[PDB]
Write a protein that binds this DNA or RNA. Structure first.
Length: 93
RNA sequence: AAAGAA
């Protein structure tokens, strides 16, 4: 027993989601950007369906917990966006 | 290139 399994899992979830919201990924992620609203937000439940997140967990409240203190993303209601200049990224649906 | 990290 060398770590708390659910805390480690939360760190994997957080870093996987922060990757999607990195500038490097966003520059090329046309699917993700077409799903943004005009303010840059995506449903957290959409992110939950992405294959690597769903592989790590199907517990939605755990994904919220994993993201609670992220400096990369901001959460409003059940939606999430890049904290820095989110409005640059949406693309037409 | 099956979501080859939507």
């Amino acid at each position: 027993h060398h770590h708390h399994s659910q805390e480690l899992l939360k760190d994997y979830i957080k870093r996987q989601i922060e990757y999607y919201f990195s500038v490097d990924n966003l520059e090329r992620d046309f699917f993700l950007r077409r799903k943004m609203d005009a303010d840059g937000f995506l449903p957290i439940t959409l992110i939950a369906s992405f294959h690597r997140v769903q592989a790590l967990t199907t517990d939605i409240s755990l994904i919220f917990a994993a993201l609670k203190d992220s400096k990369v993303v901001e959460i409003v209601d059940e939606k999430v966006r890049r904290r820095e200049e989110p409005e640059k990224w949406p693309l037409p649906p």
